[PDB]
Amino acid sequence: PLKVEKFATANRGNGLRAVTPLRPGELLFRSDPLAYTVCKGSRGVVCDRCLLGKEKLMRCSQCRVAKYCSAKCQKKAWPDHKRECKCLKSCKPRYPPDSVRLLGRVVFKLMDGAPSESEKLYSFYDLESNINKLTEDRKEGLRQLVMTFQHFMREEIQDASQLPPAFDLFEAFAKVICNSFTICNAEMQEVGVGLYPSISLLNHSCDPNCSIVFNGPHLLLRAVRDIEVGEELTICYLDMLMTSEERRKQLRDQYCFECDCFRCQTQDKDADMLTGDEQVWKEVQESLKKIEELKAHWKWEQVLAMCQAIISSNSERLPDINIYQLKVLDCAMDACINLGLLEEALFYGTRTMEPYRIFFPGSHPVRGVQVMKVGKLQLHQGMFPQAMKNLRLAFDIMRVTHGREHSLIEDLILLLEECDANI
Ligand SMILES: *c1c2c(nc3cc(C(=O)N4CCN(C(=O)OCC)CC4)ccc13)CCCC2
Ligand SMILES: C[S@@+](CC[C@H](N)C(=O)[O-])C[C@H]1O[C@@H](n2cnc3c(N)ncnc32)[C@H](O)[C@@H]1O
Ligand SMILES: [Zn+2]
Ligand SMILES: [Zn+2]
Numbered sequence: 001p002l003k004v005e006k007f008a009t010a011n012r013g014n015g016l017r018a019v020t021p022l023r024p025g026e027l028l029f030r031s032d033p034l035a036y037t038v039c040k041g042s043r044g045v046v047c048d049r050c051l052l053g054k055e056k057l058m059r060c061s062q063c064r065v066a067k068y069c070s071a072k073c074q075k076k077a078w079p080d081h082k083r084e085c086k087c088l089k090s091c092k093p094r095y096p097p098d099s100v101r102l103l104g105r106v107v108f109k110l111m112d113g114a115p116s117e118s119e120k121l122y123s124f125y126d127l128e129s130n131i132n133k134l135t136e137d138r139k140e141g142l143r144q145l146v147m148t149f150q151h152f153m154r155e156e157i158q159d160a161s162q163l164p165p166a167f168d169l170f171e172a173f174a175k176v177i178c179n180s181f182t183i184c185n186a187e188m189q190e191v192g193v194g195l196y197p198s199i200s201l202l203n204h205s206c207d208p209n210c211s212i213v214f215n216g217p218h219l220l221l222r223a224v225r226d227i228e229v230g231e232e233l234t235i236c237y238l239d240m241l242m243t244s245e246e247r248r249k250q251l252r253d254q255y256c257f258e259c260d261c262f263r264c265q266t267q268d269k270d271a272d273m274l275t276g277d278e279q280v281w282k283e284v285q286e287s288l289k290k291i292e293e294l295k296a297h298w299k300w301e302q303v304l305a306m307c308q309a310i311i312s313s314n315s316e317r318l319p320d321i322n323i324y325q326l327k328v329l330d331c332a333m334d335a336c337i338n339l340g341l342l343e344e345a346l347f348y349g350t351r352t353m354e355p356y357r358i359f360f361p362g363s364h365p366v367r368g369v370q371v372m373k374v375g376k377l378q379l380h381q382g383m384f385p386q387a388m389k390n391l392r393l394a395f396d397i398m399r400v401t402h403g404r405e406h407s408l409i410e411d412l413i414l415l416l417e418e419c420d421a422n423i
């Protein structure tokens with residue numbers, strides 16, 4: 001028996017609403033993807049199927065683009081990979097955009113796979129396309145994505161007979177733009193992209209009552225507030241460290257709607273997000289583009305050096321509540337944790353603690369993971385009372401955002417038990 005249901009909203013198309021009263025932390029829906037693929041920057045860094053990062057990966061001898069954590073992952077991914085493997089091969093060294101590879105797996109799964117559990121509440125055919133709202137610029141880009149698809153899928157798709165019935169490629173890419181899910185690993189690293197059509201019923205809110213968390217490619221939908229019967233479920237489409245101006249631009253360009261929630265009407269937290277000298281954080285925001293680019297390709301040393309040049313700069317610095325300063329603090333923490341610089345990592349991680357409490361209110365999985373990382377760094381350095389306080393606070397957040405069903409909760413309990421034995 002399902003706790004959620006599809007329904008027609010008054011001005012937001014279709015949505016999800018509660019069949020029953022929901023409490024914080026209650027699991028609402030699990031789903032594998034209908035189709036998914038590894039991101040461009042994580043390809044060869046994480047297993048193509050399970051999206052876990054490893055020292056070494058074994059590669060597909062046929063294409064050599066697909067790489068895996070183990071022999072089980074390579075053999076199990078073969079059915080969903082066999083048709084794409086050789087549009088991939090015989091197109092080297094020309095790797096297609098992530099969206100084109102994503103749609104290729106959608107077509108193969110819809111053509112050759114059985115009815116997907118991921119389409120139980122909502123199918124790929126039902127997905128919103130927002131076609132009558134697309135600008136001519138966005139249409140032009142979708143036509144370039146269509147011809148890119150046809151060129152990449154030459155060897156396996158000759159004609160409309162090998163596409164689903166009434167399947168239009170322009171509209172399919174329109175659905176991908178506004179229904180794609182970025183997949184983040186346990187450490188909140190962007191590792192993949194996938195489609196979850198039943199989950200794609202959730203409308204956006206800048207202050208949601210639900211949350212998404214990923215266990216590999218598997219998705220868990222949870223309540224993070226109290227929700228009463230008939231109340232619509234919402235998730236935040238966007239990073240929390242965005243101003244209302246940046247949220248307006250992204251919700252327009254990608255999702256074709258104007259948000260008039262309370263937070264956007266009052267520019268909630270905008271001023272605190274941009275404290276400090278404007279010229280200083282405009283450079284940091286400009287430099288974050290390359291910093292985040294290097295992080296997407298797991299080049300941690302380059303991330304740290306650029307972040308150190310900002311955090312320990314000889315020129316004027318920013319307060320830690322400035323979102324662009326905060327992002328540099330986060331990138332530097334992840335770079336240090338992963339180069340083994342654990343005292344420098346804790347220095348940056350502890351600094352993000354108070355800004356994260358303000359910008360991730362209630363129960364947000366991003367804060368719970370950040371707090372868990374800080375508590376894990378404190379425990380590894382013998383700061384047992386300080387570590388316990390954060391590890392418990394991480395459990396108070398992540399037990400609502402992450403599940404009994406999420407593997408990271410098991411890892412947190414071990415750290416809690418270990419820290420408890422020490423105390
Ligand atoms: C990766 C990372 C961060 N947060 C994430 C949040 C989610 C998220 O729950 N999600 C984004 C995709 N989305 C959507 O586009 O709705 C319209 C279809 C649903 C909501 C995904 C991945 C995330 C935090 C920083 C670390 C990376
Ligand atoms: C992932 S789909 C959500 C389900 C969608 N309403 C449907 O019927 O399939 C995202 C699309 O829903 C609409 N939408 C989502 N959140 C909205 C909101 N808060 N206000 C207005 N429209 C919204 C936008 O058109 C967006 O392109
Ligand atoms: Zn694997
Ligand atoms: Zn292959």
Ligand SMILES: [Zn+2]
Pocket residue numbers: 205206259260261262263264
């Ligand atoms: Zn809003």
